[PDB]
Design an enzyme around this catalytic site. Structure first.
Site, short mmCIF file in Angstrom:
data_model
loop_
_atom_site.label_atom_id
_atom_site.label_comp_id
_atom_site.label_asym_id
_atom_site.label_seq_id
_atom_site.Cartn_x
_atom_site.Cartn_y
_atom_site.Cartn_z
N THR F 30 76.62 -43.43 -40.45
CA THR F 30 76.87 -42.68 -39.20
C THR F 30 77.63 -43.54 -38.19
O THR F 30 77.73 -44.76 -38.35
CB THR F 30 75.56 -42.16 -38.54
OG1 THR F 30 74.78 -43.25 -38.06
CG2 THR F 30 74.73 -41.31 -39.51
N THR F 31 78.18 -42.90 -37.17
CA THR F 31 79.00 -43.59 -36.18
C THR F 31 78.13 -44.35 -35.17
O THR F 31 77.09 -43.85 -34.74
CB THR F 31 79.94 -42.61 -35.44
OG1 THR F 31 80.59 -41.75 -36.39
CG2 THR F 31 81.00 -43.37 -34.65
#
Ligand SMILES: [Cl-]
Ligand SMILES: [Mg+2]
Lengths: 235, 241, 195, 244, 250, 243, 240, 111, 231
Positions: F30-31
């Protein structure tokens, strides 16, 4: 080559699964649990007629209230038995009592997965651990090299196991007497054994609350073999 | 062909992992240069900051090992920093044990011996770096000693390292043929830095701004790196001549 | 423990060892054999600290018996004594040393000669015509200096030994309850039952 | 991990052989021949130096024949460096025994321990075996003059005459032909040289390509002497038997 | 983590070869030529200084190394391997000899210790052999002057004269013609320079040639006076000027 | 070939393929971002809501080291936790010996050398995380990003994970438009926006926003989580910008 | 330390290193054990490709573990020395702590336990050796004969053989040995042992070794001439 | 020199009936001639109908009770919630105490 | 393929195959369900037998008076991890006189599983765990996977056909979360949830295994005739 503690794509340990194949090649061992006791019986399987069959020790005492029968690479069982005996006696020293059958089995099964890169490979032997304690009464356990153990009312292991287990499925009920169970082990052993069953190539034992763990004499087993043959001819 | 994976001999007597560690040296695409004055030793290196989000003050391949010794690396930064931390520890331990500052050439030898071990022992990989050590040694004077992944080391009149190393090397060779001497005959370190940048410009054929270069200078009893403004002052001097 | 004597004569070695085992104000036993057979022609008597004595003797016995099986050969008395000395010499610089003094009587079958070695707990070895450990020596050595001759027979050696035991029974403070006497010669080891 | 690169030096083949032991024996078969001959009044050790160069210093050299103590010597066939590791261990083992028992070590005991060390490298540790075969020549007061050999397997055996290294098959057939039990040392010297002279891969056998040693009771009264032959003494013994 | 390479990386092949030793010898073959010649009153060891770059100062790189005051060493093959061997060889001369006997080891025994170290890299876990051959020249009171070669296997041999590395085959043939047992030290230096010119291609002078002797004692190089028994090192490295003097009368 | 089967093996290029393969695990995650500001740093992360059954606000991914350093990472979450546990030991031994709390550059190199050590041997695996971290020390604010190779630099802004390119582009605009500097309270709001904009590259599952910050004025130089009114204010700012 | 699991399971449930150790036993020279009414006899083959041997000093095939127990083997000779040494040490250790020599079953069980341990220990290969262990328990006149093998299994045998061509000699013993009536005397037991080796050996010269063990530590090895008399007697009865 | 032991005083008393048992102890805790507490209990319910007190040096006493309470907990985990009988508890406490035979818990224990 | 020989090797796409194969062992395991309200937390486990003669493999393990788990996959690995949890819970009690937070329990299991995935020689754990507990911040439910990933949830399920129970709990979320001060009704919801993962077999008296912990309820396990109420 490849690691000793490697998982297969199906989610099983290669070495554990391969040790299970070694156990299938082993000689047959049967156990039956009743309210009057637990019976343990084995196929001796002498490789040659010159071999003195009474020196084949495939049923073994752990304590007075716990017995053990084996199948597979039986040399591997020596250190397992040694550990079980020490665990039983050590518990008696620390707590002034008999050790629970389940707790003994659990201690033996803790050795099973102590392998890798500890010992170099899993054990190539399965054990039937039978016993009695005050809490849970007469008990039979099947201890595998996976580190898993199941309690059983009756259980067969070794080369004739799948055939013998199906036979134990039909025959076992909760009201079996000890004498009935003795004959039932002899009956099922005779069915799955290659050579013809007698007192020299098969061995019986039991564990009762009163008398503890006893390996039967060749004279005693022979009479039970004769009693069995007469009862099958009688109908 | 597992003789190319670990540091053991190939049939033709070669260590392929050592040779491939040499190729990792140029992975950053940076060229370094070192020269000696009368009183000083100057080292210069290209500084390339491609990402706009980077803090340019933290991007550096020059290290202050001890008060007197400086080190520039050609190779990836993780291996560079590994070598730098070890050299700092070695120089400090030397001073504690033997009661005097570790010489540049002795540190070079020590780091070279460590590099050698990685080429002979299997479990340790070589570091993909070339280490150029500089100082003004109290016995030997201005000094340049360079180490590589094979565990080789030697002293230098001057040197260069990187992808376009050969162009810089010959440029310097031709100057020392002409001058007939082992060093830059110059009083101040400022003009030795100017010489170093000038000859790098000629050899590489590129112009430099203040943020395209990184400069280290060794004098008697201290080694120090130049700020962007110190370099800019230096670039202005070259331009006005 | 206390009294152990040894006399080397022409053709044999004779060891005499006291039978008493005392602890506190009680003689716990009056028939104790303070010796071990190391090999068929080598006997070791011992005296010193309680527990240590037997533990050391049996440990040496096990090692010499192991050697005998491995090589199918009996070690010479000189070789056994050197092994024993080294073990005591190691022991004296250990955390807890063996406080055991020994006499080693043996018949060398290759030389056809009896040999008597006296070794103390420090690892001090000497070959002697006659030897003793503890306070016994303070009486027996001077007595044997006078009466001993190198060419004596085993029977003469036993009479010489009776003279020592009589002197010890007369002048020693403690009751050591007599001695067990053993003879080592070309035919091996045997015990004198009436002494 | 590292499993990938493990040669597994201590395993069985499907046939029940030890790969590395077999290959070490193959290595030894290309080494210079060494002969041992046991006589009634002494032992001879002879050994052929591996293709000599004319600028090799011959007098101050030791390749094949090594002294273990005053009563025991060995002839080497294989890797010299490997042999020197084992020789220094054997020299130490002999002195440990002397320190413990105040008696010179019996020949077989020294041989067994050195052979047990070699055995270990074939069963555990994951290391390559020692590429060395020894001929042991020695004397003790139990068995008198004795000849043994040991090889990388750690197996040892006793001999009246034996060869190791190159051309053992041919050498053993010539020894088996001319050897007899009532033989003297001077006769055994001659047999050793004649056997090497025929089995050699060289054109002609010369003093500079040979190492020679005897273990006699030729000292003064009931004591053993080791004689490691000098170059000039090998030159004379080669003329005396009529080889050159 | 941890060194999991506890097994041999040098093993026997079916033919009986030790691959890694053979390959180490191949690396020695590729190396620059070095030689040694023994005289009646001395020993000479010599080699070419192959410069990696003309900017490099070849004086800082020493191919000929003092091990003890009376013993020197030169090599052919991998320089880094040589450097660490010289460090270990100097140390072992003290730990296993001088700290015990209060005197420096004789040539043959120091050689034996170096050989041991090289043998261990042939058998120990997780290591390759050393990629060098050494020529060790030395003097000691009871053996006099001597010259030894040491190979990657750990094997060593004494020599009257020899050469190793690039052009060793031709250099050995040259030495056979010129060597006799009556050579004085100056004659052996002369022959060493003649032999080495054949293998060297580029410049041939005191700055490209490295040469040292084991000869007479040098009291001037001892650093102190007052002890009569201490007379100075027999090892001496010839200077750049001293080589050029002998190249004129060549 | 086979050069990619073992860690610490150089390929003929001079590359360690196993480290490059660990980077792919980071790219999959994920970012997560980091924004340097006037007197501190701000951290933010995308938390994918796999199911309704996830308890909101109770699967915290941002971690504190000592009392002044914040760490966030993308990739294999357990590997990140292992790195933070080491960081905490390194920071504790520094404070124990030298008294002062560990400076951020000093702390960066401690993680850097430890990650680099896992590229030196074949008996270990490289780290499957890129770690964005920083805080406030005696010399002011510092932001760092550390990669599987052991490589790290100082940053004005940093981003890693599946939406890194989107976040980097948005970060580059902030650096250009605010040369004098960005404030701490602004950086929190911008962090929310950039996570929402970077969520376009991971838009199947909806997500949960998590922000933290260190600031000399706003948090007194200590690491704190953004919660309650300040969090909802930042969410609303981000919601307004996407529409 | 070297840790590698050399002995491991294969897909079909076999431990190949243990099975290949059995092949090394099959290559080894033949060894036979026959127990009578009041004795045990150990017979051993010695290959005759080795002439110019010195039989005085060459290691004998039958080894004494204690004064009352013996051990012969088939397989790798160097491996056997390690088992024999350990057994000899354990024999003396048992005397020291229990104040009684080992039983034959106990000594066998120990040797078998050592062999087993090398089949599931890291960094080691199994012993390429099977043993025959024979003797008499302390203060007992019942003969004991046990067999061990590389896996670690052990068992008691009225008569047994191991080594090369052992299946041929086991065939011989299976029909010639009567359980109801074992060899009543020493002569009968030695003869049956020599007969069984003569099926396989070649010549009855310096190829057969015989060792006789009787109760109360009474062990003796037969000489060439003594054995040759049995060989001469058997061949004359055969021609019929 | 540092003395690792102290004396915290007090006294305890156990009596057994037919179908019951009592374990009593005073609540005073002291050092030298000073009172530390007027109410500091030293008789504890350890589970499985076992009461315990370890009177003497209170640090050792609390340590021992703590270890025995923990021993009861692990007895349940390892033996399928089985009730620890008083005789088994007694033997377990012997091993706890004898484990420190050469640096003892200075206490008189009653269960 | 070439990158699944050990846990120390990454695949070219950044995968750890040995960890994924360990994850596969959980899918083969028997179903177990976890759910909670604000007052209580419940585990429901379908036990598996070898045959009619055998016993049913016990799925639920107690870690402390306020915490315990259910397992799916390799049972010996669950025994190792539960034993570690017992020790950590016990360490917190003896040293700090503090009941171990259910969140810290999860963090400790994560870090223990992780070390096995980064080092040569070892292997990942081959079991998944559902940890329930009541601590100072109320009721909790955790899901442990042997990759190291631990997750706090209102409800979940793991094992074979766990997707059926997981979907049901996703629908029922709003109902069962507010079953406060009512143990029997929260169990009923858990028993109805595990029923959605059944095929051919149904819940019998020696097949079903239920456990509960809460505000005024220690961690207790119900088997045999005690679960007959809920069939
Ligand atoms: Cl160094
Ligand atoms: Mg004395």
């Amino acid at each position: 080559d490849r690691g000793v503690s490697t998982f297969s794509p199906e989610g099983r340990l290669f070495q554990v699964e391969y040790s299970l194949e070694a156990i299938k090649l082993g000689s047959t061992a049967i156990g039956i649990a009743t309210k009057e006791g637990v019976v343990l019986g084995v196929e001796k399987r002498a490789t040659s007629p010159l071999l003195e069959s009474d020196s084949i020790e495939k049923i073994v005492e752990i304590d007075r209230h716990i017995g053990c029968a084996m199948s597979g690479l039986t040399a591997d069982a020596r250190s397992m038995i040694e550990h079980a005996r020490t665990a039983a006696v050590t518990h008696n020293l620390y707590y002034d009592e008999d050790i629970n059958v389940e707790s003994l089995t659990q201690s033996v099964c803790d050795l099973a997965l102590r392998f890798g890169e500890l010992m170099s490979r899993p054990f190539g032997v399965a054990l039937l651990i039978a016993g009695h304690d005050a809490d849970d009464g007469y008990q039979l356990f099947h201890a595998e090299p996976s580190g898993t153990f199941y309690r059983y009312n009756a259980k067969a292991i070794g080369s004739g196991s799948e055939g013998a287990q199906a036979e134990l499925l039909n025959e076992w009920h909760s009201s079996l007497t000890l004498k009935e169970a003795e004959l039932l082990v002899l009956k099922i052993l005779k069915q799955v054994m290659e050579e013809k069953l007698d007192e020299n190539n098969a061995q019986l034992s039991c564990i009762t609350k009163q008398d503890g763990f006893k390996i039967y004499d060749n004279e005693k087993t022979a009479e039970l073999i004769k009693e069995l043959k007469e009862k099958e001819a009688a109908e | 062909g597992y003789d190319r994976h670990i540091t053991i001999f190939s049939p033709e007597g070669r260590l392929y992992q050592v040779e491939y560690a040499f190729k990792a040296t140029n992975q950053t695409n940076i060229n370094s240069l070192a020269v000696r004055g009368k009183d000083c030793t100057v080292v210069i290196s290209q500084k390339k900051v491609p990402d706009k989000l980077l803090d340019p003050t933290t991007v550096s391949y020059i290290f202050c090992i001890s008060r007197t010794i400086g080190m520039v690396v050609n190779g990836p930064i993780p291996d560079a920093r590994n070598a730098a931390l070890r050299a700092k520890a070695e120089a400090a331990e030397f001073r504690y044990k033997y009661g005097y500052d570790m010489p540049c050439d002795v540190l070079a030898k020590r780091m070279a011996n460590l590099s050698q071990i990685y080429t002979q022992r299997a479990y340790m990989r070589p570091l993909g770096v070339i280490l150029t050590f500089v100082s003004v040694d109290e016995e030997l004077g201005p000094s340049i000693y360079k180490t590589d992944p094979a565990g080789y080391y030697v002293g230098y009149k001057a040197t260069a390292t990187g992808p376009k190393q050969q162009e810089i090397t010959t440029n310097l060779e031709n100057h020392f043929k002409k001058s007939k001497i082992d060093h830059i005959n110059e009083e101040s370190w400022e003009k030795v830095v100017e010489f170093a940048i000038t000859h790098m410009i000629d050899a590489l054929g590129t112009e430099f701004s203040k943020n395209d270069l990184e400069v280290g200078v060794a004098t008697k009893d201290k080694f120090f790196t130049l700020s962007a403004e110190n370099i800019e002052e230096r670039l202005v001097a070259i331009a006005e001549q | 423990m206390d009294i152990i004597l040894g006399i080397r004569v022409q053709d044999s070695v004779i060891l005499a060892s006291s039978k008493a085992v005392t602890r506190g104000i009680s003689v716990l036993k009056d028939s104790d054999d303070k010796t071990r057979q190391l090999s068929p022609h080598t006997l070791m008597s011992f005296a010193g600290e309680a527990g240590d004595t037997v533990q050391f003797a049996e440990y040496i016995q096990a090692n010499i018996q192991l050697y005998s099986i491995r090589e199918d050969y009996e070690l010479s008395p000189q070789a056994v004594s050197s092994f024993v000395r080294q073990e005591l010499a190691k022991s004296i610089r250990s955390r807890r040393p063996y406080q055991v003094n020994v006499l080693i009587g043996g018949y060398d079958k290759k030389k056809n000669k009896p040999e008597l070695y006296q070794i103390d707990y420090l690892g001090t070895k000497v070959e002697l015509p006659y030897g003793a450990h503890g306070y016994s020596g303070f009486y027996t050595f001077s007595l044997l200096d006078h009466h001993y001759r190198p060419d004596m027979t085993t029977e003469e050696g036993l009479d010489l030994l009776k003279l020592c035991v009589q002197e010890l029974e007369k002048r020693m403070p403690m009751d050591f309850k007599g001695v067990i006497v053993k003879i080592v010669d070309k035919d091996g080891i045997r015990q004198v039952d009436d002494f | 991990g590292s499993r990938r690169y493990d040669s597994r030096t201590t395993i069985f083949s499907p046939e029940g052989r030890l790969y590395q032991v077999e290959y070490a024996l193959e290595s030894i078969s290309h080494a210079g021949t060494a002969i041992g001959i046991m006589a009634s009044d002494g032992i001879v050790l002879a050994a052929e130096r591996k293709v000599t160069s004319t600028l090799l210093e011959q007098d101050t050299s030791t390749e094949k024949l090594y002294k273990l103590n005053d009563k025991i010597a060995v002839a080497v066939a294989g890797l010299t460096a490997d042999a020197e590791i084992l020789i220094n261990t054997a020299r130490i083992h002999a002195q440990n025994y002397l320190k413990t028992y105040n008696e010179d070590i019996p020949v077989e005991i020294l041989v067994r321990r050195l052979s047990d060390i070699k055995q270990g490298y074939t069963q555990h540790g994951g290391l390559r075996p020692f590429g060395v075969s020894f001929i042991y020549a020695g004397y003790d007061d139990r068995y008198g003059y004795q000849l043994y050999t040991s090889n990388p397997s750690g197996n040892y055996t006793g001999w009246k005459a034996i060869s190791v290294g190159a051309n053992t098959s041919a050498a053993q057939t010539l020894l088996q032909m001319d050897y007899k039990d009532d033989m003297k040392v001077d006769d055994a010297i001659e047999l050793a040289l004649k056997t090497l002279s025929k089995t050699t891969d060289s054109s002609a056998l010369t003093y500079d390509r040979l190492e020679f040693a005897t273990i006699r009771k030729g000292a003064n009264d009931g004591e053993v002497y080791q004689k490691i032959f000098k170059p000039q003494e090998i030159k004379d013994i080669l003329v005396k038997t009529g080889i050159t | 983590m941890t060194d999991r390479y506890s097994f041999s990386l040098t093993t026997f092949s079916p033919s009986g070869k030790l691959g890694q030793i053979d390959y180490a010898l191949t690396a020695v073959k590729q190396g620059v030529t070095s030689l040694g010649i023994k005289a009646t009153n001395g020993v000479v060891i010599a080699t070419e200084k192959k410069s990696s770059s003309p900017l490099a100062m070849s004086e800082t790189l020493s191919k000929v190394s003092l091990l003890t005051p009376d013993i020197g060493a030169v090599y052919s093959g991998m320089g880094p391997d040589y450097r660490v061997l010289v460090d270990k060889s100097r140390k072992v001369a003290h730990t296993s000899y001088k700290r015990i006997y209060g005197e420096y080891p004789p040539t043959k025994l120091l050689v034996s210790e170096v050989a041991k170290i090289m043998q261990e890299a042939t058998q120990s876990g997780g290591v390759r052999p050393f990629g060098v051959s050494l020529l060790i020249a030395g003097h000691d009171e009871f053996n006099g002057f001597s010259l030894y070669q040491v190979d990657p296997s750990g094997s060593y041999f004494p020599w009257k004269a020899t050469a190793i590395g690039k052009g060793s085959v031709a250099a050995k043939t040259f030495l056979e013609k010129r060597w006799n047992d009556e050579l004085e030290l100056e004659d052996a230096i002369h022959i060493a320079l003649l032999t080495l010119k054949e293998s060297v291609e580029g410049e041939f002078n005191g700055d490209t040639i490295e040469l040292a002797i084991i000869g007479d004692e040098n009291p001037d190089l001892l650093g102190y006076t007052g002890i009569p028994t201490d007379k100075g090192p027999r090892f001496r490295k010839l200077t750049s000027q001293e080589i050029n003097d002998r190249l004129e009368a060549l | 070939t086979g050069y990619d089967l073992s860690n610490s093996v150089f390929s003929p290029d001079g590359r360690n393929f196993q480290v490059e393969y660990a980077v792919k695990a980071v790219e999959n995650g994920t970012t997560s971002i980091g924004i340097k500001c006037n007197d501190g740093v701000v951290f933010a992360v995308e938390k994918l809501i796999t199911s309704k059954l996830l308890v909101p606000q109770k699967n915290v991914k941002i971690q504190v080291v000592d009392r002044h350093i914040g760490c966030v990472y993308s990739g294999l979450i357990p590997d990140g936790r292992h790195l933070v546990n080491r960081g905490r030991e390194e920071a504790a031994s520094f404070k124990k010996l030298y008294k002062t709390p560990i400076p951020i550059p000093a702390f960066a190199d401690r993680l850097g050398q430890y990650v680099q050590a896992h590229t030196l041997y074949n008996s270990v695996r490289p780290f499957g995380v890129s770690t964005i971290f920083g805080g406030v020390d005696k010399n002011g604010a510092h932001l760092y990003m550390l990669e599987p190779s052991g490589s790290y630099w100082g940053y004005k802004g940093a981003a890693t994970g599946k939406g890194r390119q989107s976040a980097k582009a948005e970060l580059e605009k902030l650096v250009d438009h605010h040369p004098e500097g960005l404030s701490a309270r602004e950086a929190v709001k911008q962090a929310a926006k950039i996570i929402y904009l970077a969520h376009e590259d991971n838009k199947e599952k909806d997500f949960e926003l998590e922000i933290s910050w260190c600031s000399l004025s706003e948090t007194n130089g200590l690491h704190k989580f953004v919660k309650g009114d300040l969090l909802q204010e930042a969410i609303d700012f981000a919601q307004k910008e996407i529409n | 330390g070297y840790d590698r699991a050399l002995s491991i399971f294969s897909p079909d449930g076999h431990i190949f290193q243990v099975e290949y150790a059995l092949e090394a036993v099959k290559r080894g020279t033949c060894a036979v054990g026959v127990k009578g009414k009041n004795c045990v006899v150990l017979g051993c083959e010695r290959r005759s490709t080795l002439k110019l041997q010195d039989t005085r000093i060459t290691p004998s095939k039958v080894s004494k573990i204690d004064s009352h127990v013996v051990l012969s083997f088939s397989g790798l000779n160097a491996d056997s020395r390690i088992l024999i040494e350990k057994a000899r040490v354990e024999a003396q250790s048992h005397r020291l702590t229990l104040e009684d020599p080992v039983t034959v079953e106990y000594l066998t069980r120990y040797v078998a336990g050592v062999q087993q341990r090398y089949t599931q220990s890291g960094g080691v290969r199994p012993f390429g050796v099977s043993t025959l262990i024979a003797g008499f328990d302390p203060r007992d006149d019942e003969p004991k004969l046990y067999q061990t093998e590389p896996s670690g299994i052990y068992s008691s045998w009225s008569a047994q053989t191991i080594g090369r061509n052992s299946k041929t000699v086991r065939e011989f013993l299976e029909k010639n040995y009567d359980r109801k009536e074992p060899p009543a005397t020493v002569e009968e037991c030695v003869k049956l042992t020599v007969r069984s080796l003569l099926e396989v050996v070649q010549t009855g010269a310096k190829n057969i070794e015989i060792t006789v063990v009787k109760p109360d530590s009474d062990i003796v090895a037969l000489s060439s001439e003594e054995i040759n008399q049995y060989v001469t007697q058997i061949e004359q009865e055969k021609q019929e | 020199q540092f003395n690792p032991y102290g004396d915290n005083g007090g006294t305890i008393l156990g009596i057994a009936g037919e179908d019951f048992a009592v374990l009593a102890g005073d609540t005073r805790n002291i050092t030298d001639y000073s009172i530390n507490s007027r109410y500091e209990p030293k008789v504890f319910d350890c589970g499985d109908n076992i009461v315990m007190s370890a009177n003497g040096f209170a640090a050792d006493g609390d340590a021992l009770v703590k270890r025995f309470k923990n021993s009861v907990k692990w007895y349940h985990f390892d033996h399928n919630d089985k009730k620890l009988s008083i005789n088994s508890a007694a033997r377990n406490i012997q091993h706890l105490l004898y484990g420190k035979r050469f640096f003892p818990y200075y206490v008189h224990t009653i269960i | 393929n070439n990158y699944d020989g050990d846990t120390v090797t990454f695949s070219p796409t950044g995968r750890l195959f040995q960890v994924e194969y360990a994850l596969e062992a959980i899918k083969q395991g028997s179903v177990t369900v976890g759910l909670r309200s604000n007052t209580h937390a419940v585990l429901v486990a379908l036990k598996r037998n070898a045959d009619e003669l055998s016993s049913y493999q016990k799925k639920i393990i107690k870690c402390d008076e306020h915490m315990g788990l259910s397992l799916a996959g390799l049972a010996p690995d669950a025994r190792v991890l539960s034993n570690y949890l017992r020790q950590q819970c016990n360490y917190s009690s003896l040293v700090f006189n503090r009941k171990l937070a259910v969140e810290r329990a999860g963090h400790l299991l994560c870090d223990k599983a992780q070390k096995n995935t980064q080092s040569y020689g070892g292997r990942p754990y081959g079991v998944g765990l559902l940890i329930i507990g009541y601590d100072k911040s109320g009721a909790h439910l955790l899901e442990f996977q042997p990759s190291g990933n631990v997750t706090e949830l209102y409800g979940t399920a793991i094992g074979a056909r766990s997707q059926g129970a997981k979907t049901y709990l996703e629908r029922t979320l709003d109902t069962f979360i507010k079953i406060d001060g009512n143990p029997d009704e929260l169990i009923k919801a858990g028993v109805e949830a595990i029923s959605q993962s059944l095929r051919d077999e149904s819940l019998t008296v020696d097949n079903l295994s239920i456990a509960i912990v809460g505000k005024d309820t220690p961690f207790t396990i119900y088997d045999g005739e005690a679960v007959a109420k809920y069939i």
